[PDB]
Amino acid sequence: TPQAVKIRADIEVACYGYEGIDAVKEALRAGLNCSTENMPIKINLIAPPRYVMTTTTLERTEGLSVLSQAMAVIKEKIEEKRGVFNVQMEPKVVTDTDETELARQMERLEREN
Amino acid sequence: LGQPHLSRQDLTTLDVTKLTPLSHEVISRQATINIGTIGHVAHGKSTVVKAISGVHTKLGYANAKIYKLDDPSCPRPECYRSCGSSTPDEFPTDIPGTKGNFKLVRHVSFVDCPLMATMLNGAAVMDAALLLIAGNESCPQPQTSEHLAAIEIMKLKHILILQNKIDLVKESQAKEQYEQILAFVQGTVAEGAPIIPISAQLKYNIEVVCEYIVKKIPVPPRDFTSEPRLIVIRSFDVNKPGCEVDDLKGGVAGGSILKGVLKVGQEIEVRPGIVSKDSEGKLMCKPIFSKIVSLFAEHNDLQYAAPGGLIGVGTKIDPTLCRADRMVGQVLGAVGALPEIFTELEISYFLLRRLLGQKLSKNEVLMVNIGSLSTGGRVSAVKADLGKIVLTNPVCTEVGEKIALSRRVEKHWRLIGWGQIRRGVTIKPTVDD
Amino acid sequence: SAFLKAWVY
Ligand SMILES: Nc1nc2c(ncn2[C@@H]2O[C@H](COP(=O)(O)OP(=O)(O)NP(=O)(O)O)[C@@H](O)[C@H]2O)c(=O)[nH]1
Numbered sequence: 283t284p285q286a287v288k289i290r291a292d293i294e295v296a297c298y299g300y301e302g303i304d305a306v307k308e309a310l311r312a313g314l315n316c317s318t319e320n321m322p323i324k325i326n327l328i329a330p331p332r333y334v335m336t337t338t339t340l341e342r343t344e345g346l347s348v349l350s351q352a353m354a355v356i357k358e359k360i361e362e363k364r365g366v367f368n369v370q371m372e373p374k375v376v377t378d379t380d381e382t383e384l385a386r387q388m389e390r391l392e393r394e395n
Numbered sequence: 396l397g398q399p400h401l402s403r404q405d406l407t408t409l410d411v412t413k414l415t416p417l418s419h420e421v422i423s424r425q426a427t428i429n430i431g432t433i434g435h436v437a438h439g440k441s442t443v444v445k446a447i448s449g450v451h452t453k454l455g456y457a458n459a460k461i462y463k464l465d466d467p468s469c470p471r472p473e474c475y476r477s478c479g480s481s482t483p484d485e486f487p488t489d490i491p492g493t494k495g496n497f498k499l500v501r502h503v504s505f506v507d508c509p510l511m512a513t514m515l516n517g518a519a520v521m522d523a524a525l526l527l528i529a530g531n532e533s534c535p536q537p538q539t540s541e542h543l544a545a546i547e548i549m550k551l552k553h554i555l556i557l558q559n560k561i562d563l564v565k566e567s568q569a570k571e572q573y574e575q576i577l578a579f580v581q582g583t584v585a586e587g588a589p590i591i592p593i594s595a596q597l598k599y600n601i602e603v604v605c606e607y608i609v610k611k612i613p614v615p616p617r618d619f620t621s622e623p624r625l626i627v628i629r630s631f632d633v634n635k636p637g638c639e640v641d642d643l644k645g646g647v648a649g650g651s652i653l654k655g656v657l658k659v660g661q662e663i664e665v666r667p668g669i670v671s672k673d674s675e676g677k678l679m680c681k682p683i684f685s686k687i688v689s690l691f692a693e694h695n696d697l698q699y700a701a702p703g704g705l706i707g708v709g710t711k712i713d714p715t716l717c718r719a720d721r722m723v724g725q726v727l728g729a730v731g732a733l734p735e736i737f738t739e740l741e742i743s744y745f746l747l748r749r750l751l752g753q754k755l756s757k758n759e760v761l762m763v764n765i766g767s768l769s770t771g772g773r774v775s776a777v778k779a780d781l782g783k784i785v786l787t788n789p790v791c792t793e794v795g796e797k798i799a800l801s802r803r804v805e806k807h808w809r810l811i812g813w814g815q816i817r818r819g820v821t822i823k824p825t826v827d828d
Numbered sequence: 829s830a831f832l833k834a835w836v837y
Contacts, residue, residue: 296713298669298681299684299827300684300685300686300711301711302645302710302712302713303643303644303645303711303713303714304711306643306713307640307641307643310640311640311641324639325639326637326638327638327639327643328636329632329636329718330632330634330718331713331715388636388637389636391636392635394719395632395718395719541835544831544832544835547831547832582829582830583829583831745836745837746836747835747836748833748834749834
């Protein structure tokens with residue numbers, strides 16, 4: 283197999299009225315529902331309003347599509363709820379180099395709190 | 396509920412007419428009265444608080460419970476004790492030969508500072524103060540006098556005076572300071588105040604401070620009946636990086652309540668809220684709305700929270716608004732209860748006659764403290780004890796409320812004086828129904 | 829008070 287590929291988008295998600303984070307939760311959960319048996323999706327927070335969306339796939343094309351679809355599901359839900367959505371990084375393949383620049387910046391953000 | 400030894404507060408039973416600064420329901424979990432620590436550098440301010448409370452904490456807050464042994468056989472002053480906010484409301488006595496339980500009398504918060512600005516603008520309601528005075532130094536030291544003038548100005552009557560560091564200082568020298576203090580308070584609002592010798596380091600006579608906190612400082616009046624108002628003094632994003640989605644949490648607003656009671660599940664709004672800039676640069680403000688998810692005072696969970704202490708409010712609000720103290724300066728409260736939002740103020744104002752470590756001019760640069768909001772402000776017009784200011788950031792505030800003024804002296808900010816608001820100019824809030 | 833007025837005007 284073209285040994286499994288890790289693919290990631292950075293997404294900026296927000297809501298500034300009544301339902302606040304319970305709206306943002308719901309969006310990002312709709313995102314998770316776009317996961318596939320051969321391709322789970324994981325969303326983890328970077329630092330608000332930015333979050334990290336990751337998947338493992340045997341083909342780039344299939345994974346990049348899955349994330350790019352889930353991104354839309356999310357945008358619809360937060361925009362449905364008077365909230366905001368932005369894409370900080372359209373889904374690339376993740377080099378583990380890129381992954382260390384994340385993991386280091388997450389420790390930076392722990393220290394900034 | 397998270398602390399089963401403490402008061403089971405209950406919103407079904409709460410009658411806010413029946414609350415008093417001593418209601419066990421409340422006092423079991425949160426402080427109800429605030430005691431400022433004031434002095435001079437290294438006079439032991441924070442260290443006294445650390446001694447009374449156990450706590451290690453621009454302002455800073457530390458709660459302490461205060462107990463009396465329910466034994467007639469107690470020698471004075473050791474009837475009194477203090478402990479951390481989470482400690483049980485009764486415990487059996489330490490003192491050998493004495494018998495019975497210490498019982499909780501009072502629960503207080505110490506409002507520690509590096510202070511003058513916060514005092515004069517009323518951002519920290521102080522119900523009382525501890526004036527610390529180091530024996531190894533004379534009376535007054537500069538900040539000691541400056542603070543006492545600040546006390547006079549704030550009209551705080553109830554005071555205790557602490558001669559600290561008596562472990563270093565021989566009795567002859569100790570008493571030689573005593574008259575300096577007495578003379579320094581004579582002719583001032585502190586004139587009647589008790590003087591107590593203590594060591595914060597060795598925790599000598601702390602029981603006395605507790606005794607006199609129970610006895611000299613009366614139960615202050617409170618406004619429990621109005622719809623609440625809180626000043627956001629800290630705000631937090633509680634979510635640690637990596638956060639999975641179900642485990643995402645609200646942004647948390649921390650402040651001192653001035654009136655009313657916050658209740659879990661109450662609906663709230665925040666002013667001025669989100670600030671936005673129109674086509675013509677004209678300011679526009681959208682109040683943030685939310686629901687109280689949870690309440691904290693230090694490690695104690697609450698179902699209702701009442702003035703005194705620093706109270707943490709969990710909310711629905713997106714953390715992006717709370718993170719790294721972004722909401723500090725905001726006012727929080729029940730919906731429709733909050734004050735008007737202002738951009739310009741006419742004020743009556745008074746300055747420090749001493750050039751401590753001169754009067755206004757037009758378009759002069761100021762930094763101005765209103766509630767917890769340090770904002771830029773700039774002068775519009777002038778008279779001998781009245782004038783006008785335009786504000787960089789909009790504020791939520793009340794006509795009559797105290798505000799404090801700073802100038803960029805020696806190229807950095809120092810306070811110069813204060814004033815009351817007498818009139819002002821407001822933004823219409825823009826609310827999407 | 830004179831004390832306050834020595835520090836205020
Ligand atoms: N209370 C007390 N502090 C002492 C004594 N000897 C030294 N100190 C100094 O007290 C310090 C701890 O508290 P301190 O800074 O005095 O309190 P503070 O007035 O809050 N300082 P600040 O105004 O900066 O908040 C230590 O750095 C210690 O060296 C002593 O006998 N008693």
